[PDB]
mmCIF file of C-alpha atoms and ligand atoms in Angstrom:
data_model
loop_
_atom_site.group_PDB
_atom_site.id
_atom_site.type_symbol
_atom_site.label_atom_id
_atom_site.label_comp_id
_atom_site.label_asym_id
_atom_site.label_seq_id
_atom_site.Cartn_x
_atom_site.Cartn_y
_atom_site.Cartn_z
ATOM 1 C CA UNK A 72 40.589 -4.468 -36.079
ATOM 2 C CA UNK A 73 44.187 -3.438 -36.706
ATOM 3 C CA UNK A 74 44.539 0.198 -37.544
ATOM 4 C CA UNK A 75 46.663 -0.550 -40.717
ATOM 5 C CA UNK A 76 44.923 -2.713 -43.241
ATOM 6 C CA UNK A 77 47.478 -5.185 -44.812
ATOM 7 C CA UNK A 78 44.946 -5.708 -47.573
ATOM 8 C CA UNK A 79 45.090 -1.955 -48.391
ATOM 9 C CA UNK A 80 48.911 -2.030 -48.326
ATOM 10 C CA UNK A 81 49.091 -5.182 -50.552
ATOM 11 C CA UNK A 82 46.759 -3.661 -53.012
ATOM 12 C CA UNK A 83 48.866 -0.632 -53.100
ATOM 13 C CA UNK A 84 51.514 -2.837 -54.770
ATOM 14 C CA UNK A 85 49.146 -3.733 -57.614
ATOM 15 C CA UNK A 86 47.892 -6.923 -56.049
ATOM 16 C CA UNK A 87 44.208 -7.807 -56.074
ATOM 17 C CA UNK A 88 43.688 -8.597 -52.447
ATOM 18 C CA UNK A 89 44.995 -10.042 -49.096
ATOM 19 C CA UNK A 90 42.016 -11.857 -47.707
ATOM 20 C CA UNK A 91 40.898 -14.483 -45.273
ATOM 21 C CA UNK A 92 38.000 -16.975 -44.624
ATOM 22 C CA UNK A 93 34.657 -16.953 -42.974
ATOM 23 C CA UNK A 94 31.094 -18.420 -42.566
ATOM 24 C CA UNK A 95 28.155 -17.694 -40.330
ATOM 25 C CA UNK A 96 29.640 -18.785 -37.038
ATOM 26 C CA UNK A 97 33.008 -16.836 -37.138
ATOM 27 C CA UNK A 98 31.324 -13.849 -38.675
ATOM 28 C CA UNK A 99 28.978 -13.760 -35.726
ATOM 29 C CA UNK A 100 30.716 -15.400 -32.728
ATOM 30 C CA UNK A 101 31.937 -12.008 -31.454
ATOM 31 C CA UNK A 102 32.355 -8.385 -32.485
ATOM 32 C CA UNK A 103 36.023 -8.284 -33.238
ATOM 33 C CA UNK A 104 36.175 -11.036 -35.882
ATOM 34 C CA UNK A 105 33.674 -9.449 -38.409
ATOM 35 C CA UNK A 106 35.169 -6.044 -37.667
ATOM 36 C CA UNK A 107 38.713 -7.383 -38.395
ATOM 37 C CA UNK A 108 37.425 -8.872 -41.637
ATOM 38 C CA UNK A 109 35.986 -5.590 -42.925
ATOM 39 C CA UNK A 110 38.901 -3.531 -41.842
ATOM 40 C CA UNK A 111 42.002 -5.485 -42.704
ATOM 41 C CA UNK A 112 41.149 -7.963 -45.431
ATOM 42 C CA UNK A 113 39.566 -7.564 -48.931
ATOM 43 C CA UNK A 114 38.495 -11.060 -49.889
ATOM 44 C CA UNK A 115 36.655 -14.036 -48.374
ATOM 45 C CA UNK A 116 36.614 -17.798 -48.991
ATOM 46 C CA UNK A 117 33.803 -19.710 -47.301
ATOM 47 C CA UNK A 118 35.570 -22.094 -44.920
ATOM 48 C CA UNK A 119 32.994 -24.802 -45.459
ATOM 49 C CA UNK A 120 29.622 -23.665 -46.836
ATOM 50 C CA UNK A 121 30.379 -24.211 -50.474
ATOM 51 C CA UNK A 122 31.775 -27.731 -50.282
ATOM 52 C CA UNK A 123 29.806 -30.621 -51.779
ATOM 53 C CA UNK A 124 28.708 -32.076 -48.367
ATOM 54 C CA UNK A 125 27.326 -28.607 -47.509
ATOM 55 C CA UNK A 126 25.677 -27.775 -50.799
ATOM 56 C CA UNK A 127 24.325 -31.087 -52.133
ATOM 57 C CA UNK A 128 23.858 -33.515 -49.256
ATOM 58 C CA UNK A 129 21.460 -35.546 -51.315
ATOM 59 C CA UNK A 130 21.456 -36.157 -55.123
ATOM 60 C CA UNK A 131 19.797 -33.083 -56.798
ATOM 61 C CA UNK A 132 18.899 -31.386 -53.552
ATOM 62 C CA UNK A 133 20.738 -28.288 -52.662
ATOM 63 C CA UNK A 134 21.198 -26.573 -49.300
ATOM 64 C CA UNK A 135 22.470 -22.969 -49.789
ATOM 65 C CA UNK A 136 21.751 -21.257 -46.483
ATOM 66 C CA UNK A 137 25.399 -21.106 -45.230
ATOM 67 C CA UNK A 138 26.865 -20.127 -48.562
ATOM 68 C CA UNK A 139 24.202 -17.550 -49.215
ATOM 69 C CA UNK A 140 25.072 -15.875 -45.862
ATOM 70 C CA UNK A 141 28.843 -15.932 -46.620
ATOM 71 C CA UNK A 142 28.240 -14.503 -50.122
ATOM 72 C CA UNK A 143 25.825 -11.931 -48.809
ATOM 73 C CA UNK A 144 28.180 -10.697 -46.162
ATOM 74 C CA UNK A 145 31.112 -10.370 -48.603
ATOM 75 C CA UNK A 146 29.001 -8.660 -51.238
ATOM 76 C CA UNK A 147 27.586 -6.312 -48.612
ATOM 77 C CA UNK A 148 31.032 -5.212 -47.443
ATOM 78 C CA UNK A 149 32.902 -5.033 -50.678
ATOM 79 C CA UNK A 150 34.902 -8.202 -50.295
ATOM 80 C CA UNK A 151 35.964 -10.259 -53.367
ATOM 81 C CA UNK A 152 34.849 -13.920 -53.153
ATOM 82 C CA UNK A 153 36.747 -17.140 -53.977
ATOM 83 C CA UNK A 154 34.291 -20.033 -54.287
ATOM 84 C CA UNK A 155 35.543 -23.088 -52.619
ATOM 85 C CA UNK A 156 35.297 -25.888 -53.668
ATOM 86 C CA UNK A 157 33.424 -27.629 -56.555
ATOM 87 C CA UNK A 158 35.262 -31.060 -57.094
ATOM 88 C CA UNK A 159 37.041 -32.606 -54.199
ATOM 89 C CA UNK A 160 37.517 -36.196 -52.797
ATOM 90 C CA UNK A 161 37.067 -35.021 -49.241
ATOM 91 C CA UNK A 162 33.872 -33.593 -47.601
ATOM 92 C CA UNK A 163 32.115 -35.470 -50.417
ATOM 93 C CA UNK A 164 28.684 -37.130 -49.738
ATOM 94 C CA UNK A 165 28.606 -40.893 -49.916
ATOM 95 C CA UNK A 166 25.999 -40.758 -52.733
ATOM 96 C CA UNK A 167 28.565 -39.362 -55.139
ATOM 97 C CA UNK A 168 31.474 -41.710 -54.254
ATOM 98 C CA UNK A 169 29.249 -44.757 -54.632
ATOM 99 C CA UNK A 170 28.439 -43.971 -58.317
ATOM 100 C CA UNK A 171 30.187 -46.408 -60.702
ATOM 101 C CA UNK A 172 28.685 -45.555 -64.083
ATOM 102 C CA UNK A 173 30.784 -42.964 -66.032
ATOM 103 C CA UNK A 174 27.966 -41.055 -67.666
ATOM 104 C CA UNK A 175 26.043 -40.906 -64.438
ATOM 105 C CA UNK A 176 28.962 -39.421 -62.528
ATOM 106 C CA UNK A 177 29.539 -36.963 -65.324
ATOM 107 C CA UNK A 178 25.920 -35.837 -65.285
ATOM 108 C CA UNK A 179 26.101 -35.459 -61.448
ATOM 109 C CA UNK A 180 29.388 -33.601 -61.696
ATOM 110 C CA UNK A 181 27.967 -31.188 -64.232
ATOM 111 C CA UNK A 182 24.767 -30.567 -62.378
ATOM 112 C CA UNK A 183 26.590 -29.912 -59.134
ATOM 113 C CA UNK A 184 28.969 -27.402 -60.868
ATOM 114 C CA UNK A 185 26.147 -25.711 -62.809
ATOM 115 C CA UNK A 186 23.751 -25.308 -59.846
ATOM 116 C CA UNK A 187 26.333 -24.040 -57.366
ATOM 117 C CA UNK A 188 28.011 -21.708 -59.921
ATOM 118 C CA UNK A 189 24.724 -20.460 -61.359
ATOM 119 C CA UNK A 190 23.422 -19.369 -57.944
ATOM 120 C CA UNK A 191 26.339 -16.904 -57.550
ATOM 121 C CA UNK A 192 26.980 -16.202 -61.144
ATOM 122 C CA UNK A 193 28.831 -12.858 -61.587
ATOM 123 C CA UNK A 194 29.617 -12.522 -57.902
ATOM 124 C CA UNK A 195 32.574 -14.866 -57.640
ATOM 125 C CA UNK A 196 36.104 -13.602 -58.380
ATOM 126 C CA UNK A 197 37.603 -17.083 -58.442
ATOM 127 C CA UNK A 198 36.386 -20.721 -58.140
ATOM 128 C CA UNK A 199 38.608 -23.473 -56.860
ATOM 129 C CA UNK A 200 37.112 -25.759 -59.472
ATOM 130 C CA UNK A 201 39.288 -28.733 -58.612
ATOM 131 C CA UNK A 202 40.825 -29.413 -55.138
ATOM 132 C CA UNK A 203 43.753 -31.668 -54.311
ATOM 133 C CA UNK A 204 43.660 -33.983 -57.271
ATOM 134 C CA UNK A 205 47.334 -34.917 -57.005
ATOM 135 C CA UNK A 206 49.291 -37.441 -55.047
ATOM 136 C CA UNK A 207 52.514 -36.258 -53.573
ATOM 137 C CA UNK A 208 54.522 -37.824 -56.327
ATOM 138 C CA UNK A 209 52.805 -35.711 -58.971
ATOM 139 C CA UNK A 210 50.438 -38.518 -60.335
ATOM 140 C CA UNK A 211 46.707 -38.070 -60.262
ATOM 141 C CA UNK A 212 44.917 -39.012 -57.113
ATOM 142 C CA UNK A 213 42.509 -41.967 -57.557
ATOM 143 C CA UNK A 214 39.465 -40.286 -56.312
ATOM 144 C CA UNK A 215 35.961 -41.378 -57.416
ATOM 145 C CA UNK A 216 36.120 -38.879 -60.224
ATOM 146 C CA UNK A 217 39.472 -40.075 -61.475
ATOM 147 C CA UNK A 218 38.611 -43.780 -61.150
ATOM 148 C CA UNK A 219 35.169 -43.604 -62.733
ATOM 149 C CA UNK A 220 35.606 -40.881 -65.339
ATOM 150 C CA UNK A 221 39.306 -40.914 -65.888
ATOM 151 C CA UNK A 222 41.556 -37.915 -66.600
ATOM 152 C CA UNK A 223 38.854 -36.363 -68.721
ATOM 153 C CA UNK A 224 36.945 -35.163 -65.625
ATOM 154 C CA UNK A 225 39.451 -32.350 -65.519
ATOM 155 C CA UNK A 226 38.403 -31.130 -68.917
ATOM 156 C CA UNK A 227 34.672 -31.641 -68.050
ATOM 157 C CA UNK A 228 34.855 -29.709 -64.815
ATOM 158 C CA UNK A 229 36.707 -26.704 -66.249
ATOM 159 C CA UNK A 230 34.695 -26.530 -69.451
ATOM 160 C CA UNK A 231 31.412 -26.689 -67.604
ATOM 161 C CA UNK A 232 32.659 -24.001 -65.142
ATOM 162 C CA UNK A 233 33.800 -21.734 -68.005
ATOM 163 C CA UNK A 234 30.318 -21.906 -69.695
ATOM 164 C CA UNK A 235 28.339 -21.462 -66.530
ATOM 165 C CA UNK A 236 30.151 -18.360 -65.292
ATOM 166 C CA UNK A 237 32.775 -16.977 -67.854
ATOM 167 C CA UNK A 238 33.334 -14.067 -65.384
ATOM 168 C CA UNK A 239 35.061 -16.179 -62.753
ATOM 169 C CA UNK A 240 38.734 -17.257 -62.648
ATOM 170 C CA UNK A 241 38.837 -21.008 -62.827
ATOM 171 C CA UNK A 242 41.433 -22.552 -60.485
ATOM 172 C CA UNK A 243 43.043 -25.806 -59.678
ATOM 173 C CA UNK A 244 44.031 -25.817 -55.982
ATOM 174 C CA UNK A 245 46.475 -28.015 -54.018
ATOM 175 C CA UNK A 246 48.708 -28.237 -50.939
ATOM 176 C CA UNK A 247 52.414 -29.030 -50.664
ATOM 177 C CA UNK A 248 53.348 -26.925 -53.703
ATOM 178 C CA UNK A 249 55.696 -25.145 -51.350
ATOM 179 C CA UNK A 250 59.262 -25.548 -52.699
ATOM 180 C CA UNK A 251 60.583 -25.683 -56.272
ATOM 181 C CA UNK A 252 61.696 -29.039 -57.338
ATOM 182 C CA UNK A 253 59.115 -30.919 -55.110
ATOM 183 C CA UNK A 254 57.459 -33.844 -56.951
ATOM 184 C CA UNK A 255 53.979 -32.518 -56.565
ATOM 185 C CA UNK A 256 55.065 -29.032 -57.906
ATOM 186 C CA UNK A 257 56.594 -30.746 -60.899
ATOM 187 C CA UNK A 258 53.398 -32.887 -61.295
ATOM 188 C CA UNK A 259 51.233 -29.715 -61.073
ATOM 189 C CA UNK A 260 53.267 -27.855 -63.673
ATOM 190 C CA UNK A 261 53.583 -30.612 -66.257
ATOM 191 C CA UNK A 262 49.925 -31.523 -66.045
ATOM 192 C CA UNK A 263 48.642 -27.935 -66.294
ATOM 193 C CA UNK A 264 51.055 -27.361 -69.360
ATOM 194 C CA UNK A 265 49.375 -30.286 -71.011
ATOM 195 C CA UNK A 266 45.926 -29.292 -70.080
ATOM 196 C CA UNK A 267 46.341 -25.703 -71.229
ATOM 197 C CA UNK A 268 47.853 -26.959 -74.489
ATOM 198 C CA UNK A 269 44.705 -29.039 -75.020
ATOM 199 C CA UNK A 270 42.454 -26.095 -74.454
ATOM 200 C CA UNK A 271 41.279 -26.683 -71.031
ATOM 201 C CA UNK A 272 40.238 -23.293 -69.472
ATOM 202 C CA UNK A 273 42.431 -23.214 -66.374
ATOM 203 C CA UNK A 274 42.906 -19.575 -65.387
ATOM 204 C CA UNK A 275 45.054 -20.064 -62.222
ATOM 205 C CA UNK A 276 46.855 -22.449 -59.931
ATOM 206 C CA UNK A 277 46.065 -22.090 -56.241
ATOM 207 C CA UNK A 278 48.728 -22.975 -53.694
ATOM 208 C CA UNK A 279 47.274 -23.644 -50.231
ATOM 209 C CA UNK A 280 50.568 -23.089 -48.350
ATOM 210 C CA UNK A 281 49.767 -24.856 -44.990
ATOM 211 C CA UNK A 282 53.268 -24.443 -43.575
ATOM 212 C CA UNK A 283 55.361 -25.407 -40.707
ATOM 213 C CA UNK A 284 57.849 -23.052 -38.873
ATOM 214 C CA UNK A 285 60.752 -21.995 -41.055
ATOM 215 C CA UNK A 286 59.231 -23.049 -44.387
ATOM 216 C CA UNK A 287 58.298 -19.553 -45.506
ATOM 217 C CA UNK A 288 61.591 -18.963 -47.338
ATOM 218 C CA UNK A 289 61.060 -21.687 -49.890
ATOM 219 C CA UNK A 290 57.675 -20.349 -51.091
ATOM 220 C CA UNK A 291 59.202 -17.835 -53.448
ATOM 221 C CA UNK A 292 60.788 -20.509 -55.584
ATOM 222 C CA UNK A 293 57.638 -22.616 -55.461
ATOM 223 C CA UNK A 294 55.581 -19.794 -56.906
ATOM 224 C CA UNK A 295 58.363 -19.189 -59.560
ATOM 225 C CA UNK A 296 58.020 -22.898 -60.549
ATOM 226 C CA UNK A 297 54.247 -22.746 -60.623
ATOM 227 C CA UNK A 298 54.432 -19.693 -62.819
ATOM 228 C CA UNK A 299 55.966 -21.970 -65.548
ATOM 229 C CA UNK A 300 52.758 -23.947 -65.952
ATOM 230 C CA UNK A 301 51.595 -21.155 -68.057
ATOM 231 C CA UNK A 302 48.383 -20.037 -66.377
ATOM 232 C CA UNK A 303 47.337 -16.351 -66.388
ATOM 233 C CA UNK A 304 47.683 -16.182 -62.636
ATOM 234 C CA UNK A 305 48.448 -18.038 -59.342
ATOM 235 C CA UNK A 306 47.436 -17.378 -55.788
ATOM 236 C CA UNK A 307 48.259 -18.425 -52.211
ATOM 237 C CA UNK A 308 44.895 -19.716 -51.117
ATOM 238 C CA UNK A 309 45.008 -21.167 -47.621
ATOM 239 C CA UNK A 310 47.968 -19.660 -45.761
ATOM 240 C CA UNK A 311 48.812 -20.417 -42.193
ATOM 241 C CA UNK A 312 52.151 -21.117 -40.618
ATOM 242 C CA UNK A 313 52.812 -23.003 -37.446
ATOM 243 C CA UNK A 314 54.266 -20.435 -34.889
ATOM 244 C CA UNK A 315 53.187 -17.513 -37.042
ATOM 245 C CA UNK A 316 56.639 -15.960 -36.949
ATOM 246 C CA UNK A 317 57.226 -12.676 -38.707
ATOM 247 C CA UNK A 318 60.207 -14.069 -40.709
ATOM 248 C CA UNK A 319 57.931 -16.878 -42.231
ATOM 249 C CA UNK A 320 54.960 -14.581 -42.803
ATOM 250 C CA UNK A 321 56.911 -11.750 -44.343
ATOM 251 C CA UNK A 322 58.807 -14.295 -46.456
ATOM 252 C CA UNK A 323 55.472 -15.663 -47.825
ATOM 253 C CA UNK A 324 54.037 -12.190 -48.385
ATOM 254 C CA UNK A 325 57.270 -11.227 -50.329
ATOM 255 C CA UNK A 326 57.076 -14.460 -52.225
ATOM 256 C CA UNK A 327 53.827 -13.259 -53.749
ATOM 257 C CA UNK A 328 54.783 -9.626 -53.905
ATOM 258 C CA UNK A 329 57.720 -10.450 -56.051
ATOM 259 C CA UNK A 330 56.067 -12.790 -58.507
ATOM 260 C CA UNK A 331 53.986 -11.115 -61.283
ATOM 261 C CA UNK A 332 51.492 -13.861 -61.455
ATOM 262 C CA UNK A 333 50.530 -13.963 -57.792
ATOM 263 C CA UNK A 334 47.363 -11.929 -57.635
ATOM 264 C CA UNK A 335 46.681 -12.359 -53.900
ATOM 265 C CA UNK A 336 46.905 -14.119 -50.693
ATOM 266 C CA UNK A 337 44.170 -15.695 -48.505
ATOM 267 C CA UNK A 338 45.111 -16.495 -44.895
ATOM 268 C CA UNK A 339 43.070 -19.594 -43.675
ATOM 269 C CA UNK A 340 41.435 -17.948 -40.720
ATOM 270 C CA UNK A 341 41.566 -14.636 -38.787
ATOM 271 C CA UNK A 342 42.278 -15.534 -35.112
ATOM 272 C CA UNK A 343 44.031 -18.594 -33.719
ATOM 273 C CA UNK A 344 41.075 -20.061 -31.704
ATOM 274 C CA UNK A 345 39.162 -20.457 -34.968
ATOM 275 C CA UNK A 346 42.057 -22.049 -36.860
ATOM 276 C CA UNK A 347 41.698 -25.660 -38.106
ATOM 277 C CA UNK A 348 45.300 -25.982 -36.756
ATOM 278 C CA UNK A 349 44.612 -24.007 -33.533
ATOM 279 C CA UNK A 350 47.188 -25.796 -31.359
ATOM 280 C CA UNK A 351 50.005 -24.451 -33.617
ATOM 281 C CA UNK A 352 48.744 -20.714 -33.454
ATOM 282 C CA UNK A 353 49.321 -20.244 -37.206
ATOM 283 C CA UNK A 354 47.199 -17.125 -37.833
ATOM 284 C CA UNK A 355 47.756 -13.292 -37.703
ATOM 285 C CA UNK A 356 45.455 -12.599 -34.756
ATOM 286 C CA UNK A 357 45.578 -14.198 -31.341
ATOM 287 C CA UNK A 358 43.168 -15.602 -28.807
ATOM 288 C CA UNK A 359 42.028 -12.153 -27.988
ATOM 289 C CA UNK A 360 41.437 -11.251 -31.694
ATOM 290 C CA UNK A 361 44.370 -8.790 -31.433
ATOM 291 C CA UNK A 362 47.053 -8.413 -34.095
ATOM 292 C CA UNK A 363 50.131 -10.618 -33.540
ATOM 293 C CA UNK A 364 53.701 -9.463 -34.370
ATOM 294 C CA UNK A 365 53.571 -11.064 -37.827
ATOM 295 C CA UNK A 366 50.551 -8.911 -38.777
ATOM 296 C CA UNK A 367 52.510 -5.773 -37.972
ATOM 297 C CA UNK A 368 55.701 -7.243 -39.674
ATOM 298 C CA UNK A 369 53.641 -7.824 -42.889
ATOM 299 C CA UNK A 370 52.284 -4.244 -42.720
ATOM 300 C CA UNK A 371 55.720 -2.692 -42.288
ATOM 301 C CA UNK A 372 57.068 -4.901 -45.157
ATOM 302 C CA UNK A 373 54.462 -3.319 -47.521
HETATM 303 O O1 LIG B 513 31.703 -30.915 -39.628
HETATM 304 C C1 LIG B 513 32.451 -30.108 -40.567
HETATM 305 C C2 LIG B 513 33.837 -30.023 -40.112
HETATM 306 O O2 LIG B 513 34.451 -31.215 -39.880
HETATM 307 C C3 LIG B 513 34.639 -29.252 -41.261
HETATM 308 O O3 LIG B 513 35.910 -28.803 -40.822
HETATM 309 C C4 LIG B 513 36.667 -28.115 -41.780
HETATM 310 C C5 LIG B 513 37.555 -29.103 -42.567
HETATM 311 O O4 LIG B 513 38.170 -28.472 -43.707
HETATM 312 C C6 LIG B 513 38.911 -27.228 -43.400
HETATM 313 O O5 LIG B 513 39.065 -26.516 -44.585
HETATM 314 C C7 LIG B 513 39.914 -27.152 -45.502
HETATM 315 C C8 LIG B 513 41.430 -27.225 -45.017
HETATM 316 O O6 LIG B 513 42.295 -28.165 -45.867
HETATM 317 C C9 LIG B 513 42.090 -27.998 -47.318
HETATM 318 O O7 LIG B 513 42.209 -29.308 -47.781
HETATM 319 C C10 LIG B 513 40.657 -27.466 -47.794
HETATM 320 O O8 LIG B 513 40.794 -26.878 -49.047
HETATM 321 C C11 LIG B 513 39.936 -26.482 -46.828
HETATM 322 O O9 LIG B 513 38.623 -26.288 -47.368
HETATM 323 C C12 LIG B 513 38.109 -26.311 -42.421
HETATM 324 O O10 LIG B 513 39.128 -25.273 -42.002
HETATM 325 C C13 LIG B 513 37.575 -27.034 -41.198
HETATM 326 O O11 LIG B 513 36.810 -26.229 -40.480
HETATM 327 O O12 LIG B 513 33.867 -28.288 -41.833
HETATM 328 C C14 LIG B 513 32.865 -27.710 -40.966
HETATM 329 C C15 LIG B 513 31.810 -28.744 -40.688
HETATM 330 O O13 LIG B 513 30.701 -28.750 -41.728
HETATM 331 O O1 LIG B 514 42.901 -31.087 -46.256
HETATM 332 C C1 LIG B 514 43.823 -32.176 -46.055
HETATM 333 C C2 LIG B 514 45.274 -31.704 -45.973
HETATM 334 O O2 LIG B 514 45.321 -30.892 -44.817
HETATM 335 C C3 LIG B 514 46.248 -32.919 -45.849
HETATM 336 O O3 LIG B 514 47.578 -32.447 -45.894
HETATM 337 C C4 LIG B 514 48.003 -31.564 -44.874
HETATM 338 C C5 LIG B 514 47.812 -30.144 -45.297
HETATM 339 O O4 LIG B 514 48.145 -29.292 -44.149
HETATM 340 C C6 LIG B 514 48.334 -30.014 -43.036
HETATM 341 O O5 LIG B 514 48.472 -29.190 -41.912
HETATM 342 C C7 LIG B 514 49.654 -30.775 -43.207
HETATM 343 O O6 LIG B 514 50.750 -30.003 -43.256
HETATM 344 C C8 LIG B 514 49.459 -31.748 -44.396
HETATM 345 O O7 LIG B 514 49.698 -33.071 -44.132
HETATM 346 O O8 LIG B 514 46.058 -33.812 -46.865
HETATM 347 C C9 LIG B 514 44.704 -34.304 -47.004
HETATM 348 C C10 LIG B 514 43.741 -33.183 -47.252
HETATM 349 O O9 LIG B 514 42.382 -33.690 -47.379
HETATM 350 O O1 XYP B 515 20.667 -15.318 -52.116
HETATM 351 C C1 XYP B 515 21.021 -15.689 -53.424
HETATM 352 C C2 XYP B 515 22.180 -14.903 -53.942
HETATM 353 O O2 XYP B 515 23.311 -14.989 -52.997
HETATM 354 C C3 XYP B 515 22.628 -15.373 -55.218
HETATM 355 O O3 XYP B 515 23.725 -14.629 -55.734
HETATM 356 O O4 XYP B 515 21.557 -15.231 -56.159
HETATM 357 C C4 XYP B 515 20.349 -16.012 -55.797
HETATM 358 C C5 XYP B 515 19.893 -15.575 -54.386
HETATM 359 O O5 XYP B 515 18.812 -16.547 -53.971
#
């Protein structure tokens, strides 16, 4: 645990949280990891336990052991929770992607959203309802949901989520929304404006922010562009930067800090060894679960 909590310092500026991710393994693999989580971060996203493959491996049969644990740990230690993720083309069981009948897929979609959301009703701050539904050019990704249901699955998913747990912030999450003017950013903005105009309950836009070295400085403009979609809020949801330089990290923190709509930042992991991009050492803590320079830089920037 770092003496100074960047979450505490971020919240001091009116932000909701500066959090990270977890699940049974990382929360129990050693003493430092969970201790770092409770001391320096104020929100948790299950790294894998809430995905479709992990929650509904077979049609109508749910497995909630991993997610229950993550939720219970967060709830027991005062951490906000971002559910992740309800509708996604990846980590999706084959039984879903093989469905060809529109009404059957809609029924399955709704039951999955309903069951997973109902179990944690009232405990989730935000839900990444939809994940990565855009192609890089801004057009809709041809996943099973898009191909079988058509664009209406967007309305269906959000409306179902809204009715199931009206207390949660409903989000659409995606990566590569990292610089203003980028085709995917333009596509995210125009689509959300349209959906919001049609009455679709989209509360926020989540920008993953999986960056390479030196890309931190363009994030501020990206957030500014995303703010034009018209959602109540936006958030950096899965932040990690190859090289984890202070300049990049502080640039990204400032990007959120200076944009009214950005409610928080979630770093995709605590320490480098547990990163899904470990070879690039993209996190705030190192192989010894000790604060890296960027962590301190962030703290001194707040
Ligand atoms: O066997 C499973 C692993 O293969 C799997 O690894 C995770 C893959 O997803 C990573 O999280 C995503 C990163 O990219 C974005 O598109 C998503 O929104 C994130 O959810 C995660 O970091 C890897 O650990 O999951 C664990 C095993 O079940
Ligand atoms: O989850 C993956 C994404 O990671 C992938 O795009 C990645 C995102 O971050 C990666 O490190 C890299 O910068 C991008 O190419 O796109 C497919 C999606 O399922
Ligand atoms: O453990 C579960 C809890 O996490 C959920 O919120 O409510 C139902 C319980 O079974």
